[PDB]
A paper describes a structure:
The kallikrein-related proteases are a family of secreted serine proteases, a number of which have been implicated in viral replication. KLK6, associated with neurological diseases like MS, Alzheimer's,5 and Parkinson's,6 and with the migration and invasion, and thereby metastasis, of tumor cells, has also recently been linked to the zoster (chickenpox) virus. Infected keratinocytes were found to overexpress KLK6 and MDM2, and their overexpression was directly linked to viral propagation. We recently reported the synthesis and biological characterization of highly potent benzamidine KLK6 inhibitors DKFZ-917 (1) and DKFZ-918 (2), with pIC50 values of 8.6 and 8.3, respectively, and good selectivity over related serine proteases.12 In order to perform more advanced preclinical experiments with these substances, and to be able to make them freely available to other researchers, we required larger quantities than were originally prepared in the hit-to-lead optimization process.
Author numbering: 16 to 36, 38 to 67, 69 to 71, 77 to 125, 127 to 130, 132 to 147, 150 to 205, 210 to 222, ...
Write the structure that this text describes.
């Protein structure tokens, strides 16, 4: 993410890092000892999930099953969500904790934050997790930002002052509002930066029932 700074070691216990063949690929959110949520465009073979990373608190697991939303549309990023079934149950340890979903699509909090190990503004990739406060942007204003591209399955969020924004390598990471999972990093402007066009996030509240069915099955 661009224009933020390093999170506190204790302020991000739900954050996952997703690797493929030894390369950082995406972020992700622990939402249940056995399940990580991320973006559907993060589907790759040979996935490795690292939890409790920012190391002693860290833990690593293979993926047993990667369930892409049935209706994911790659060209438009509509329905950009994936569930990952961990081989090894997560060891909850205060540096590793699930995050509750936002279940109400009309929740009023518009002050949020984002997190990831994706690209910083200098085009580099950081060893330490980055954080930024941003705000939700109204659907109408986001539709104007990107005509023909914002569905009910997405939410927009950004920062008019400094342009704080997610970026490549942040995909699947959490948009957190009122300490609930509101969104997943999905797509946005390139070069990354939100002073003109907001970041676009998968609208997590619309997937409560699909998440519930997949886990509980
Ligand atoms: C799964 C591959 C990975 N895909 C992405 O990161 C997606 C997310 N995204 C993007 C763009 C802008 C914003 C925003 N402005 N809010 N948010 C997300 C893209 O443009 O592509 C990837 C793409 C390109 C370089 C990478 C380098 C290292 C690791 C992963 C990389």
């Amino acid at each position: 993410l661009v224009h933020g700074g390093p999170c506190d070691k204790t302020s991000h216990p739900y954050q996952a890092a997703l690797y493929t063949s030894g390369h950082l690929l995406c972020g992700g959110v622990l939402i249940h000892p056995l399940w990580v949520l991320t973006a559907a465009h993060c589907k790759k073979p040979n996935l490795q999930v690292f939890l409790g990373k920012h190391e002693s608190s860290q833990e690593q697991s293979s993926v047993v099953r990667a369930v892409i939303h049935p209706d994911y549309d790659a060209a438009s990023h509509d329905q950009d969500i994936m569930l990952l079934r961990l081989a090894r149950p997560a060891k909850l340890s205060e540096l590793i904790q699930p995050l509750p979903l936002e279940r109400d699509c009309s929740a009023q909090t518009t002050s949020c934050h984002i997190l990831g190990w994706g690209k910083t503004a200098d085009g580099d990739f950081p060893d330490t997790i980055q954080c930024a406060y941003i705000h939700l942007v109204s659907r109408e204003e986001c539709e104007h930002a990107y005509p023909g591209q914002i569905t009910q399955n997405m939410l927009c969020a950004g920062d008019e002052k400094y342009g704080k924004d997610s970026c490549q390598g942040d995909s699947g990471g959490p948009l957190v509002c009122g300490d609930h999972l509101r969104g997943l990093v999905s797509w946005g402007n390139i070069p990354c930066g939100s002073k003109e066009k907001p970041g676009v996030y998968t609208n997590v509240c619309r997937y409560t029932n699909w998440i519930q069915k997949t886990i509980q099955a």
